[PDB]
């Protein structure tokens, strides 16, 4: 659904790809775990490992990211957190 980016430490091109990738994952899967798995795997392939992705409706997080590889955004009511670390 509607993509809203709240925070990002990421280039403009990677930001759009993160949203697009999550959007496709959300279209294909209903289960958040499987949505996250799609998003993570695609990023490892295109932008090198190691990415991590969390998708959900209710959580708080405190994580560490590599510069230029973190985004936090919503698709409707579902939040997606994606970053590299390691």
């Amino acid at each position: 659904r509607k993509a809203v980016i709240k925070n990002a430490d990421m280039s403009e091109e990677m930001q759009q790809d993160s949203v697009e990738c999550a959007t496709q994952a959300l279209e294909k899967y209903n289960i958040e775990k499987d949505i996250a798995a799609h998003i993570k795997k695609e990023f490892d392939k295109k932008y090198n490992p190691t990415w991590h992705c969390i998708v959900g409706r209710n959580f708080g997080s405190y994580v560490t990211h590599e510069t230029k590889h973190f985004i936090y955004f919503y698709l409707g009511q579902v939040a997606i957190l994606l970053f590299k670390s390691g």
Binding site: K6, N7, D9, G56, R57, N58, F59, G60, S61, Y62, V63, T64, H65, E66, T67, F70, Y72, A79, L81, S85
Partner: peptide
């Protein structure tokens, strides 16, 4: 270079 960041749904 790494940074600590907060998020919350």
């Amino acid at each position: 270079e790494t940074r600590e960041v907060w998020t919350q749904h």
